[PDB]
């Protein structure tokens, strides 16, 4: 629904190497458009969408410069974190960051995001007021006090309200040809044996974009989600995505059931039933 930008950043330390592995990935409307990786031949922010090619060389040197700053910031934080959690040297550890902003259909700031994780667990997050912080444990409380003192919240607030939103407009305008596209799901139903007098009906949705989609079964026209196996939406690898829902019904009474598929690319939802 709401347009969005995100920067997903990761730092991984490792035994032997003094420099940790840093990777930053940028998303516009959940579609990857830029990437930085420290282990690349010539580390810089690369375009990963065809519509980003039109940015000038000056744009890319600014972004690469910020990546270098973040590498240094992540390195220092990984070291502090190691001390906070009383961990031994020579190990391997992860520091993750999610930054970004949501826009309303009216094209302005809806919600701002800024949150960190350590070893894949929540560490600290900027609150929705963009003023206060939520620390997951005692380690993160030490970071909180330090950041409260320095006015770190204000800094990120100016980013999420300022440049995050301003630059999202430019990216949305430049690449609306590809971003606002919608490929409709081509759907069907398969029938498979499960046990004595019971059958698995599976509802397929294939070749759809964007990933947002809802599949539900129903009994006699009434929504049915009791014990519905619903798989994780997965990429086809050609731009589009795939998904299925399934339900276990009695043998002979399969006609009673129908699948329902909702997707923004359709003029109206698909209703399907397994036929011989």
């Amino acid at each position: 629904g709401p347009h969005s930008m995100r920067y997903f950043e990761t730092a991984v330390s490792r035994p032997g190497l003094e420099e940790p592995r840093y990777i930053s990935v940028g998303y516009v409307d959940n579609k990857e458009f830029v990437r930085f990786d420290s282990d690349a031949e010539n580390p810089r922010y690369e375009p990963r969408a065809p519509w980003m090619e039109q940015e000038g060389p000056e744009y890319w040197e600014r972004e690469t410069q910020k990546a270098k700053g973040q590498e240094q910031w992540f390195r220092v934080s990984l070291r502090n974190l190691l001390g906070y959690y009383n961990q031994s040297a020579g190990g391997s550890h992860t520091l993750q960051q999610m930054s970004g902003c949501d826009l309303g259909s009216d094209w302005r700031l809806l919600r701002g995001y800024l949150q960190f994780a350590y070893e894949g667990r929540d560490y600290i997050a900027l609150n929705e007021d963009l003023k206060t912080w939520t620390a997951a444990d005692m380690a993160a409380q030490i970071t909180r006090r330090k950041w409260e003192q320095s006015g770190a919240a204000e800094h990120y607030k100016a980013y999420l309200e300022g440049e995050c939103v301003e630059w999202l407009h430019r990216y949305l305008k430049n690449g609306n040809a590809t971003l606002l596209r919608t490929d409709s799901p081509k759907a069907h139903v398969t029938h498979h044996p499960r046990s004595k007098g019971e059958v698995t009906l599976r509802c397929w949705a294939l070749g759809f974009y964007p990933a947002d989609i809802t599949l539900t079964w129903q009994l006699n026209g009434e929504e049915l989600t009791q014990d519905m196996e619903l798989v994780e939406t997965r990429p086809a690898g050609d731009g589009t995505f795939q998904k299925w829902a399934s339900v276990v019904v009695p043998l002979g009474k399969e006609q009673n059931y129908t699948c329902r598929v909702y997707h923004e690319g359709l003029p109206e939802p698909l209703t399907l039933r397994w036929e011989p």
């Binding site: 830029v34 973040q70 910031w73 950041w147 995050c164």
Partner: peptide, 9 residues
């Protein structure tokens, strides 16, 4: 346009 962090954890 990526962010620039200000104060380490």
């Amino acid at each position: 346009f990526a962010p620039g962090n200000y104060x380490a954890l």
